[model samples]
Target: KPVWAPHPTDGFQVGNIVDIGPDSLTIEPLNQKGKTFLALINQVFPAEEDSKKDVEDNCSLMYLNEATLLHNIKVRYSKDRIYTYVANILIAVNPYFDIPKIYSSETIKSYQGKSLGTMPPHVFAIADKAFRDMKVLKLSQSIIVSGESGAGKTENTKFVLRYLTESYGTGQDIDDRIVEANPLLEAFGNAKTVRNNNSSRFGKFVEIHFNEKSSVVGGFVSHYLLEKSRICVQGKEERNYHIFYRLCAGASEDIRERLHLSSPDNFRYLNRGCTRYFANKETDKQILQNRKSPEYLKAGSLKDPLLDDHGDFIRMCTAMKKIGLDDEEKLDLFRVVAGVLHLGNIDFEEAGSTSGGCNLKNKSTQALEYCAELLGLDQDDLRVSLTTRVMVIKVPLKVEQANNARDALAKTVYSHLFDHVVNRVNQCFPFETSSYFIGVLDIAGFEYFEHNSFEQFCINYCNEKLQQFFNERILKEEQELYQKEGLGVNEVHYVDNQDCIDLIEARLVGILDILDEENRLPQPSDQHFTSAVHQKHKDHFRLSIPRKSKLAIHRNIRDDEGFIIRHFAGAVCYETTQFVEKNNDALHMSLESLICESRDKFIRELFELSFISVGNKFKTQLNLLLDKLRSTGASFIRCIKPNLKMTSHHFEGAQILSQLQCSGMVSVLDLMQGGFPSRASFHELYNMYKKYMPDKLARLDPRLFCKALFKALGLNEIDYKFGLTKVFFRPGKFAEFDQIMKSDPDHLAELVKRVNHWLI
Candidate 1:
């Protein structure tokens, strides 16, 4: 049983250790490596351990507590093993490389109908359990997949959906379409960020409905918080939406000519820092190397040999068609894209007049002409929209105001287009009536940056709320079970971030409320908004600090520019440079009039501008998400990033440990071990185990009958609890009882004899 060996065709294979030295170990191969060899300590462990069955199961590690659990996960990860389990909770570490064999059809089929830990830990097992529970219990279920960026949350979500389809689908075309929808969503909504190459810039919730017989029915998708600002600006070494570059790199000659697109550098928005082809060597290296670790691959790891293939662009077009977008709609979509690009190329200059107005520079005429042609507007009217403002109450506009108006126009158009696309995609899948469904939530991860703005503020705030939900649902609920059972255990106190949430989202005095009020003012400015916030929240703990110190607090106040928030993960300083403007997010009446009168039907519907403002809309969506989550039973998948470099072989212990602490994994384990392992109501106990009791005892009270039955089974006072309405059994106690009744033939026969005697 202790023996091991390397594979027959491979030299560095698994083997049994014969002797240990300070620097090397002697091993004898059990099967293929006929001769013994000396191997370094590190090499022997890495080469010998089998990733498929490194141990019998991960359940035993829960008994050893958090540190031991973390150590086993790290050790297994050193050899490219990723998934682990803490009770029913699944802890997955990102491997940063594809392991095809682990997720093959054969592997998925093997996990079916098996117990949670009967096989190696896997995402498939989690999916299988949720699927079965929905059918058996007739209750709605949800899977919450969460982690920091680049932790494989998106990939794990895909695995869950794939397994569900294979297990329950009727081989329908809708199932295939459901799978195809992901690539289209990613192409449009995902972007390259500092932490992840293809980071999802939006939050998505997918609900898979099932019929009475467990057959797959239709599904629905809900999207939230697109990082629309990324469309206009990106950080250093980052790219905008993948569709933009894919189109530029892969478009055919005719398509390129029609769109007026050459290389990315030719468009001002596409070539902010430097312009390059999508698949060019320099751009490829920047994405792949920074996205994954340099040690994992050489330059240009993504190989698309089509110098003129235009495959990604063609695939997007085909997918859009399949998703029910008409030919004219698709043309209009790209036309808007081209218009935005052309608009970015138009620059402004002083009009050389006394009024301090601005005009399009002479160099911008060609770009301005292209933009006007693409957007179905006259060149003169388009110029006026950018370089001048309408006389609203006869107020004069300056050059800086004109520039701000132009950028705002671009941002508004891009954001509206994104919303339009999402709404259309949702229309493709009509909701179906079903007994129950399994919902999957995959959202953007928590983020921190060198310069924090309103965008970062909202992103971090969302994570805080999500983390708080996890704490309440899993960790807090576990502790409450012990208290409800009258276990006399001291209450466990987990960190609650509701105070932090209140600081940002509180009603009249909260940050959003104040911002909304300021936006509604006759004349709104960032300075006045900052002053109001400082005065209102002077007593709040989360925002108690000023930007810089002055002599005796008057001098220390400096300018009202920034505020600090104490988040559950960490503290973030948010600058109020353009916070009020972003919150208001209103388009000029003249620009709205032009868009509303466009020939494109879709564009007109999107630009009606009748919806709530951006800040209020985001808050409403957040509340809706929380309501949906609260109504269903939840299972968690805690994704852990193994290293900052995104490589497989290396594990950063310090970074991972910090995440573990903040995620509340340690508290979960502690409460799981402290509480009762299993429980049943009085009615359930009477129905299940009352056969063993004599007629005289069976007719007694249900709680007393349960106590008498357990007394006969030799369970002590410490092993079980007699609650007001239910019975709770300590860890391993209920399993032992279940095994005896199921496995012992003599005991089962005796129970049958007693039941027959009572009947006679």
Candidate 2:
């Protein structure tokens, strides 16, 4: 007898491997028995395979690999050949396979045919099943979805919450406010990154607490540190998203005067040095069309009732101004952007060498100063920041230096200015602590492009952590629980391989602490890391770094003639040696507990909050735990992880083939049979036997004609029994008879031969 419950099954079984039929094994779990069961391999899984290895040794691809066979055990026996079953993965490698009810897209699509509408398929399937299972099996738990940026992790997450919201929001009492929150969340939280043009750069978690009536009592959002820095600067080969560009491009005339600017094209900081040549052309078009207009205005609409009444476009402009700029400033700032564009066009003539040089474009200097003032910085500071030591040109290298390095520098500056724009926009909404329904993280994946250096490590290491998180949440926990119930599943665990955890630790707690300390002491370089007037992080959590240059590295330079120089903040240099690192016992203790506390599923309570009458009894306990947790330590941490695996193909067939070939022993023909079988055409059938069947059934002595017919019609192995059928079938004898014909062709053939004259 089986000792514990098996992993969640998707109601399928595995058959013999073939090259031309269905690549997977499908089963009629409820209506078929031993001899009656039919295992037809699905052929749609293996036609497209890529053998070329990516730079990374690990198959570049990470999802759904070789050890992914579906298995099932019959249950809910009926007299009429129908019997329900559960999944038992035969070839499992990941622990997530041990989950008892992991539904698929097909299952969700099928559910769409039922009652639920406009809900995330994954969320509904997991929640509804838990509600049902809780009654009989007492299985209630929380579901966590963790993956690096641009992996559809956030979108998928939103669907889960949508399902819950719609599930409870059945009545006409529409909470228009909740519907409105989506736009507000995305504008502030998500941005453009190299991988995903629109990606979320923070972590979010929401809990939907239900009332006694099964209605949404309330929900809260727990947001971690947003990538606010992204607003100001971007790495090479990337551009900031359109919000900032839109602000500069569409600012009102009065708004332009405040910052004493000329136009977006004049400032290198306006369009990342490409205001003239490449002015975010698409975004310009989008602003003209007023598309996504409402999203732009969400931040403003929250405060000003008149703007909300005005609808999204005009309101969006108001929001832009509200975020950080007044009408005068907006117009003047864009003028700086325009100045940058025209100045970049002015060619420079370097007549002298070393430190002695003269300028031909005196107008360019004026343009640079005006642009700097519009960016809220002194011109000298801008020059110093842009002319730092590392930025200057030295000896020649194999690759020629870029011609438009100044523009590059300008774009970097503009990106930061834009970051400020976003920060202001984020400020409009009254910060609330609503429960999290979904979180979208827009961090980048582990990058392996040219110059895979420290930042790449930062990005990739972030992905590794996320991978570990996903594995634990989806695979490890599910497998452990399943095994404890006696259904042994493949064990999976992800590890963090960091040699110097101290550096990261210091950056987070130490630097911030020291900076906040100066906020009290008020030293000369007191507010070096953070802005002087703006002390959000420092005042709130005392998280700041003192005596540090605030100028961002990505754009702290300007290109003059053929040399790179820091022209933003000044010639700032760093001297690092050693430190008597004092006791950060308080921070250390808090962080340690936080790390430890993060482990628990808080499962029982999660279901209670999500469900109502079904799991009504669980609410009290969950609330109690929640309260306890809130009291013990309500702090959060910001950790990022990048992805290691890369995606090569998008088409399903190609994806499956690439997946199979990724494993050396898997044959192309066999994969084709198991993955892509849609219909039994002569082209497919003849190839099936010729390629796979004859070799295995060689000694069976089935006639050549029989073998040909078997391949032609795509035969599957089946078992049948008459007496057992009458007892289990649901619709009585008719259902039993139906199963015999559909699933048990062997029995049907015997019956057919017994009455051979009937056919003639």
Candidate 3:
């Protein structure tokens, strides 16, 4: 039976509501939390034809009937939505609810003083609390939100930050300046993607540490991957994000004239790339340009159409200016861009017998020199920057690849421009103190479209470790709460399950660790890992792995050692070398072990459920490929929840347990029984009396507070269902019930098992 059973030997089920109050309920053991649920529930009847329907009708939400509520007064399932849901409603009620379809400051103010209860809010709230309490916990909140292009990973992350900043901020005027900087940051930091109207094809996290006053102290940003290749080229259906088109399309009149080209719409450079589908995906160039046109203002619409793009650009320019660049520097940047454009126009010519060189088409040599000066280099340096090729045989310019000039110049120009923007953003860093810190990671999830292959493996692998980190924290904290409350430990829940996270860690990280480790490969049964699959990793940069299809490393490493490599599908490649070399190699290897075991378990479950196991087979192949990565010294975090707090339905109690223990509120003994419900007996007569008179008292409401629970458990509706609505707290209430905290993870889990006496 599950540990939640409030009634021990009563006729009612474990989910049953034994007792009720105007505010909450108590349930019995059978209906509260049953042992051998499938067997016990079916004991009343013979083998049923449809197993699903039997469980649904006999042991579903209806199990919480009135009889159970009276018997186990404290074990009723709640009609109340999870805490985050309630919090979201509160946030929606706020008058300043400005939704951000794109990232900007206006959307930020709307979420201030509101609840951190929904998706991003719930995700970041834990991180925020960790910063306040752990001091040096190295708290990181990572969102792996992913789907097609418009799934909203970029914009939502900004909203999360907005919500967190507002909640943590003092709501004073001094903090407004810091708040206003978001748009300025987005202006230069993010860009349009084919998938999103405004997509951020990079990973960003804002690390903030507060001062004693709780204002910003000092912070630094750790940026991992950015898809900069799109700056030079884009897919057919997708256009670059609005910022790129905005800057290029809406250039000031003088700058436009200086470039000696038509508007952005006419530039072949902006529209030449191909997407897998949607060939004519609209770019934002025209949209940005038209917004600032004479037509909008002439209509006397005082609605300032330029308020979006023009103002944003000006702010970005202001930031750039603050980064200490003069007019010459600004012009220099534009010149590099212009030179790259001209290089693209430099048609290749088969000069008699030569392979590749600029055709020039009789353009001025002076123009070439001018382009060189703008790029911050002399003609000779420009040659090297653009060609990166030496004079082979030193005849009359023996060049390398055809129009390599164009590729070289374009990459250089775009990289420098993007880097400049990143540097400027960092320079304007906010002040944060030591100790407490808040790190919010906004990055892409495991990307798997029609062409998902090795790249998907790498992306998903990173996500696995991240998700494991979050889940482990929740699990460990719950057990600790039980220990503090004097609940006998050592028998906590440990329902091992595997999901997407396992595939990445096992197949991807395992491979990388194996390959990167010194003298680790070629020894069977060595228990040391080798990166069999890390070779296919791709991020902001493409990383090559050491092991070949068979198990060779040296040859595999040669092709993808340094520099960036782009896939035809708009994804970037990555290398895990830095992640391994810079930190303890064993930590990642340990992660790989967890990942591998998880994959194995996932496969077995897939077979058990009759889900297609073909994909599982492929995963298995990679598992075998990375077989050498098993060793000790792995950093392991326990992720076993107490039996009662396993599902999302019990998340309220789960979060409360996590919060109190982690928050150090475990020391407060009185907080446990402050508002706990009383016990009751389970019987037919008691239920009838309770259900009809749900509001028998002036203190709480029964019907509204209780649920159908499951007819077998017999917990009906009760009152004061919305009390938490007013106070906005679940953690305090939980502390009121569970007074103690368990031991550090593993030991605490054991105690939960013993206390429940039901294989918890």
Candidate 4:
């Protein structure tokens, strides 16, 4: 038999068994020419047949491992079958094109009330099950959709929300409003990147709350840390948040004139990267210029249907009104957005040959002139504040220090703007009388960039925690549930990334602990912080130096300036440049006073916040997020990008392999095989089969009747187990149990005779 087996390096592959030695084996791979492999007896785990090709449910594969699963997905995705299930979980491939047929209203009707694996897999099936489980169990649910930047997690979340709304109604007129919230928050939090247009710059958990009546009532949106660095600088092809570009392209001429909404290239923040709006008039004209510059987006294109800045601006503006803002409030927010752009343009002039000080540039003083009017800051007060620290004793800053102060305030202002916008969005969906909620968590996955920094450090650390939660919730919890069931099955345990998480988040002497300590020192520098980390956790397995990277360039570039972490995605090295200051993220006291002492309530209330370091606050939010998630019934969806080109009908083996490898692709079914993974309550089984019975068997106590029926079916004791309330089956035995139960009564009636003969 051709079997699916695990390889030490390649994960899994399908091949035919050949010569069997005393302690080893020879196997020929499927695409056989000279690809035969010899394996140690223990490393080769085995089962399979190609007749089961393109199986709808991954659990149906006779052989289960990474190789077979990968082949199954590539085969189905080629036929545009983008959604497939692995056990109860869903695996979604990014088809990169729209298919109207699968997500239509008729498709929704077809999936209603269907059990998992009863039909072709779709995201609708996952949503319907969440709705169904919430109704029957009365417990909240969490749909965890995760993937890389362009793997289409956002689109899958959209479809999940759509199916929930269409299948279950909100009693009020709020369903459409619930869907529109995306455009509003996205305009402020999403941005362009090398991988995808409209990539989310923040992580958000959108909870759709329901009342006792089980209809949608209200909702909540909890956001994670915003990538504030994008406010001041972006790489060559990337742009800042969508709102800035949208405002420039879509606002009325009078509004643009009032806000000093000049060309994007005029502002240093926007000019550092792309200055073109998303495929609009500006982008179309700049298409020629884009060719001359690096066209770094996928497929050398800047066109995505949902990425048009002018169109999205109009939609988000309407969305704001629905979120309870008036025109004046929107205009005020737009003014702040413009103020950040002008704040970026504030240049400095060094005062004297002997002076360690600088003043704002004379002609370019127009930037501060407009910045003050837009943000409601007193211009002379702002100048003095930007030029000195409060203890500035009118302390005059060097020229570079002045620019740092300017960008710091701008970053804080935009981050607070993000917070304000989400709060307003939450206000629109308040669930005062709510009982339970289905929270859809969509976040970016792990990354290792060319110029990794404190931001990438935080981002990957977030991934570390999310992966830990997944392992604990699914793999670990499933084992615990079996243990608590009092069944004598052998425990299937997973060693978590807890060690790695502890290294970063330990209460004392952890990475975060060291960061906050080093951050507070007056003489803090990148070198000192790197030294602190090395001194604290010198031989920790997860942490490394950039010099250890295989790429020779990394060693040449930074031996002492950066450290590396062995993240689940890969070993990523992080540069310590401005690491302390980015995480410190504190505004100069004068700027804080400028806002608190201004006429703007919007700006004043923001600085009233606390003084925790970024790493500390980031850790706090994540722990709280995990607690809420642990209390819910979690359904997972893993998004996969088939190719780096982001094109349809094409597949790249290595790219998909990386995504699969990070997942540590499971033997979910293997664990199931070692335990009773399938179960049905005795009372439910009796109710289902009572019709194929005599009156004696029909009226018997449900558990007694189940006992008789099990004997009549002639199943081995090893194949099934009796628990307090349910009859459980060995992993693959459930298929037989299901078949016999649903078959004709000709044999069922024979089984009835055998059961009643004893009972009567």
How do all models score by TM-score?
A: 0.81, 0.40, 0.48, 0.86
For TM-score, candidate 2 versus 4, the one ahead is 4
Report how far off residue 466 is in candidate 2 (Å).
Answer: 2.8
Across residues 560-660, which tens digit of lDDT does each residue of candidate 4 receive? 58888787557888888878787776666677778778677766765662235998888888888888898998988989887767688876765786677
Error of 2 at 404 (Å): 15
Residues 284-380, model 2: lDDT tens digits: 3434323223323342211211112123334455544533446654444344444344334333344354643323344557654654444444454
How do the residues 1-760 of candidate 1 rate in per-residue lDDT, one tens digit apiece? 2232223222234467878899888887767456777766644432223334343234454243444455667777866678877656788998887765988878878977655656677888888868866775687889999888988898899898888877677766666556666767777787766567677888898888888888777677888878767777675567677767666655555656677875565666766632333354544433322222222233333332321113556677888787677888877777777777788888888776676578888998988888777777778877777766664343335667776776777778877878777777767755657888888999976776656788887878888888888878766776677677666755668677888888788887878888877777778777787778778887776674445322232233345676667788777766678887777566877776766776656667778722235666787888888887887778888899877765666677657766776777765665655566556777775665565556776777888766655665557887777776767765435344343334245665565455445445
Model 4: which residue pairs collide?
Answer: 389-392, 392-395
Off by over 4 Å in 2: 1-151, 157-195, 199-238, 253-361, 365-369, 372-443, 487-652, 655-760
Worst 10 residues of 2 by lDDT: 83-92
State residue 551's C-alpha deviation in candidate 4, in Å.
4.6
What TM-score does candidate 3 get on C-alpha atoms?
0.48
lDDT of each: 0.69, 0.32, 0.36, 0.77
Ranking by lDDT: 4, 1, 3, 2
